[PDB]
């Protein structure tokens, strides 16, 4: 059998202008050969993209956060990292690591999330 496992940290109240970096660890099963992304979801709004990394195809980036956060990983730690910078106050959500690999798996997991919040 394998094991799954997605834990996230990194969240936190900033100011405007301020910045996080979130990070997703994973079981070795999803890091080796799932890809990876971050996800996030303000309360009364539907979940949304942000960015992802891996899995067979290039980092992709949702256009909200082009140019602020930048996404990278870790072979050494199975993790993949948010590096979030200008933050805003729409910016606040909380934030998931999601793992998923639709050519093999009819699965998608997710993290419990982290909660980012930018606040004045």
């Known amino acids: 059998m394998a094991e799954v496992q997605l834990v996230e940290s990194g969240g936190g109240l900033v100011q405007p202008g301020g910045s996080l970096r979130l990070s997703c660890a994973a079981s070795d099963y999803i890091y080796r050969r799932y890809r990876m992304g971050w996800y996030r979801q303000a309360p009364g709004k539907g979940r949304e993209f942000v960015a992802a990394i891996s899995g067979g195809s290039s980092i992709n980036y949702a256009d909200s956060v082009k140019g602020r956060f930048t996404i990278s990983r870790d072979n050494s730690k199975n993790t993949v990292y948010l590096q979030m910078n200008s933050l805003r106050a729409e910016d606040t959500a909380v934030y998931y690591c999601?793992?998923?690999?639709?050519?093999?798996?009819?699965?998608?997991?997710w993290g419990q999330g982290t909660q980012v919040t930018v606040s004045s």
């Open positions: 999601a793992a998923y690999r639709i050519v093999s798996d009819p699965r998608v997991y």
